[PDB]
Amino acid sequence: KEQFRETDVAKKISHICFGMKSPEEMRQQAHIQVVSKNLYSQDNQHAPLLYGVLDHRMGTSEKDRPCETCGKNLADCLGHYGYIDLELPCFHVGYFRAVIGILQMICKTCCHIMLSQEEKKQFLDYLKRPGLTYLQKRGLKKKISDKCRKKNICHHCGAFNGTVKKCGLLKIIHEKYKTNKKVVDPIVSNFLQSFETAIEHNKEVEPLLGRAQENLNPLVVLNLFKRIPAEDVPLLLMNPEAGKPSDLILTRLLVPPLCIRPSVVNEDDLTMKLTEIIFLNDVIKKHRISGAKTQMIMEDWDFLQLQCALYINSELSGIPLNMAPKKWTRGFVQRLKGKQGRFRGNLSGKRVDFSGRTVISPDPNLRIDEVAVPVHVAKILTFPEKVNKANINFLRKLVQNGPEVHPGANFIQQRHTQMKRFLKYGNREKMAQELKYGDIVERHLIDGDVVLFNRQPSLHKLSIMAHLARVKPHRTFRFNECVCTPYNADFDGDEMNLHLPQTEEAKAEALVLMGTKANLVTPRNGEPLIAAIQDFLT
């Protein structure tokens, strides 16, 4: 009647493999096409235009108006993509230092790679060895471009290949027709004499034709990169199963879902840059129809290379003065770098809950592995105590006390349910007689719990230890003064942090490893730190 299906498909990560998508796999990932520049409609309904940015077929960013692709709210949807088409190709600002690196090693006439045959046989067998590391891939492209840039004639077609260097903000030049004081070559003579038509009506061509070289644009290097042989793509050190050389020039641009850009920041800096790209898709298109000059086309197309480059990285170096930004916007790079980036602000260290911070004050009537948690913090910081055969009659009383009397519980949770019933409302003596084996009582912090204890400049590993909490009525954290040496606290308006673990494994790793009785010596040389201090030595 019914077919099998695996119920809980859990899998572990094995390896992260970076790469890039071709401009026709971006079409296969997204859902809509984005053509409209304007964020919201003209009426009062606060609804976005149905084929633009902020469309709600691309994920949601509020609980009020749900998404349209999968009909779920903010707390359920992963987010969905859209794409923008470009009528002119542009560089991606990250890959631009490797766009030049390929045009130094390939030709610009036959698109083959510039090596002799015995040199090609050496590297293609070097890349067959197992255990090839990332260091041994970066060092190989250094050695191949030392061989390709010393050759200037091709072994397959025979064209001249001058050097390739940067000549401005996202502009690539190619010295094909350099001149010398020697005898004039036949290939430099014919190009320099076929200017006969342009000099007739334009006088200024004649002084300026000594600098005429093949200015390469994204229209050329899109055409050149579609004809690179796939036997010679791995000698560009690109992995051919993660990207093509045609993919480094973008002709179609994905937009992020609204889980990446919130609705009220009103709109995000990466939303405002996607308005300026779509608007310059219709200004450049307008000047193609209504007949503008080439000095207006190449001017407006310099913006589209710029407005995609600052969209990704908004701290470029060589921007001209007529095109520099007036205000500062976050690009994608500036929300990855720095202290308030992802990797230092939200990934390596992140804001946690079940914590507390209060002024400290001394108390020697506790043991050296105890800490006095106030009642106001112990009523808030809770621990999920799973019900089993041992603690059922204890947790019934801790439910019957409730959220106000101190040995109590703030929540309750059934066996296979994911909701929590707030225990202040309803009758508690009915919810205590309806406890089953496997429900979760979230009791208050009581005497004997394992809790961590932190001081904020954390130099060595004894700046954070785990103590056994014991509730006391006054409003400070309190510990014996033998533990003033590891934390380096001094009780003069000094604050310390607290962290209650929430799992049993996190309790046992805090009690055995991070105990105060198991950390009496420093790991540096083996000298005791928890010992007597002033008024216990005098």
Partner: protein, 99 residues
């Protein structure tokens, strides 16, 4: 011995760490965060999740400390147990027909 195990004295800079460590996330969670990302996109570089600083980002437990060994369960079990005998399809009664 950590500075001199590749035959060269490597620093504790972002240039010595870029020759010791191999993980893209470990290189890009410290300094020059964007350039390692575009370089690993260019080379098609696969990364392992074996190191410490990329287990904390991916939320998997690290390999050092208590994450180096596996705990089994001492279950009362019979591995390779007594099977049930096949009666019809044995080898001695089903010699094939073709020559």
């Amino acid at each position: 011995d950590l500075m001199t195990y590749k035959g060269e004295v490597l620093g504790i800079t972002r240039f010595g760490l870029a020759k010791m460590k191999e993980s893209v996330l470990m290189l890009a969670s410290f300094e020059k965060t964007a350039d390692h990302l575009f370089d690993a996109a260019y080379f098609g570089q696969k990364d392992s999740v074996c190191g410490v600083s990329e287990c904390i980002i991916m939320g998997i437990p690290m390999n050092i400390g208590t994450g180096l060994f596996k705990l089994l369960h001492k279950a009362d079990r019979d591995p390779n147990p007594p099977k049930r005998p096949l009666i019809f399809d044995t080898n001695e009664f089903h010699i094939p027909l073709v020559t």
